[PDB]
Structure 1
Amino acid sequence: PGGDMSEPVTQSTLRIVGAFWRLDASLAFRRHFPAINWNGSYSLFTSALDPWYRENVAEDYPELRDAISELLQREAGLQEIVQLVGPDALQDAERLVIEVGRIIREDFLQQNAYHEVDAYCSMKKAYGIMKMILAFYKEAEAAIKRGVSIDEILQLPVLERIGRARYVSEEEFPAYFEEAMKEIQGAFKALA
């Protein structure tokens, strides 16, 4: 009736459906599309679908997906602290996880339904994007441990590569993914 999930129809529906895609208008206001709220949304088919993912896209897919979910959870859990004080005053590791959460939101969760290429995405393309993001996070965590500035990382040329990743065609994606995984490793190797 007004977005109250406690009403009888919603309660009866959520008791039998296997997934709930809690579409949210707040994300649509902020131009986040498909505007699915990753919080308050769930799917019960991950555990049963895990063998198919391991066979058909990559053996490491469930763990990579869990890593992305954990990064999103950390970004969510730092929201009150980044609300009380601005992100610039926030600690360096917290700043990095906030930034990687933003990177995920902007380049993996975001999807242009009207784009001539980004309207559709294969499982392997999503896997490649997720692996690029976790490679970036691993390298940036190591670099933060070895003392580079977060504002240096936040300007790396690999970031626009990861951003443009989701706009490449499906047949071009494998070579792009390979060369981007080369570029990210080289760039973070060059840093001190």
Structure 2
Amino acid sequence: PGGDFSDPVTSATLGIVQVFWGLDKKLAQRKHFPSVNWLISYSKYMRALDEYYDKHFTEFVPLRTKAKEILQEEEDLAEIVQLVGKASLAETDKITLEVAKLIKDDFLQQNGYTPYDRFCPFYKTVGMLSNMISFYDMARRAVETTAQSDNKITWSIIREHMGEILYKLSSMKFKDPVKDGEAKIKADYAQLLEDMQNAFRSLE
């Protein structure tokens, strides 16, 4: 009654249920379907499904761990950057913030009624997260390595160099797996990954 989580019904539910998907009215104000919170939600079946997921995919655990770390880092830095003014930031911190708002805009947001977005299978989610994690690793590595030698790669510089590829990352969602075949999507994402590597190597 009012969104406060201290009421008896919720308190009883917490001690019984094992999967908890807490929602947030602020995202709902922002029209961010689904308005999951992804800081208080938890699942007690993480290790239960490791054997199943490793029987099939096996490229998921680094993605999950890195994603949780990235979101935690951004959430920790949100208050300090708010207080200072979002100016005194190291290159690694800037990279983390940039990829964080990207992954929010690209993976968290979702609408279940746009035709291409009515359904999204697990292989496609894994592929998208893998592409984003590859972006993060490559960009962080590039800026980190070049931070010490010469011609330090700035966020503005990489953004200028491959702003279009960022739009491609934005428009990955427009697939509609009902119509277009799985192999076509996999090939397109592989080609995109190769293009991303080439764009990075252009300035490397």
TM over 0.5: yes
Q: Using the TM superposition, name which of 115-124 and 86-95 deviates more.
A: 86-95
Which residue does 1:142 correspond to in 2? 141
- Give the TM-score normalised by structure 1: 0.93
In structure 1, what is the equivalent of residue 44 of structure 2? 44
Unpaired segments of 5 or more residues in structure 2? 147-151
> For the Cα contact (< 8 Å) 2:115–2:176, is it kept in 1?
no
Identity rate of aligned residues, in percent? 37
The SS at the match of 2:113 is coil
Q: TM-score of the superposition, structure 2-length normalised?
A: 0.88
Pick from 158, 167, 170: which aligns with 1:163? 170
| Kept after mapping to 2: 8 A contact 1:54/1:62 | no
Pairing of 1:4-23 with structure 2 (within 5 A): 4-23=4-23
Equivalent position of 1:184 in the other structure: 196
Distance in 2 of aligned mates of 1:191 and 1:29: 40
Aligned residue pair count: 191
In our comparison, the structure showing a higher alpha carbon Rg is 2
2 CA distance for matches of 1:47 and 1:166? 29
Q: 5 Å matches for 1:2-151?
A: 2-56=2-56, 58-145=57-144, 146=146, 147-151=152-156
Tell me whether 46-55 or 35-44 shows the greater mean CA deviation: 46-55
**Given the alignment, which residue of 148, 159, 165 partners 1:154?**
159
- d(CA) in 1 for partners of 2:186, 2:102: 21
Cα distance, 1:181 vs structure 2: 1.0
CA distance in 2 between counterparts of 1:66 and 1:86 reads 29
State the shift of 1:144 in Å. Answer: 1.1
Aligned partner of residue 50 in structure 2, secondary structure: helix
Aligned-pair CA distance for 1:7: 1.7
Q: Which one is further off, 85-94 or 168-177?
A: 85-94
Deviating more after overlay: 129-138 vs 165-174: 165-174
Distance 2:190 2:95 in 1: 25
Deviations 1:32-82 (A, max 9, x none): 2211111111111121112222223x1121221121111111111111112
- Are 2:186 and 1:174 equivalent residues in the alignment? yes
RMSD: 1.5
Structure 1 consecutive aligned stretches of length 4 or more whose deviation exceeds 4 Å: none
C-alpha contact 1:111 1:118 (8 A) present in aligned 2: yes
Shift in Å, 1:12: 1.0
Does the CA-based 8 Å contact 1:87-1:95 persist in structure 2? no
Unaligned 5+ runs, structure 1: none
CA contact (8 A) 2:131 2:193 kept: yes
Measure the CA separation in 1 of the matches of 2:44 and 2:102.
26
SS of the residue corresponding to residue 38 of structure 1 reads coil
SS in 2 for 1:113: coil
Query: Partner letter of residue 40 of structure 1?
Result: I
Deviation at 1:88, TM superposition (A): 4.2
Q: Deviations over 1:13-37 (max 9, x none)?
A: 1111111111111012223221111
Cα distance in 1 between the residues matched to 2:176 and 2:87: 36
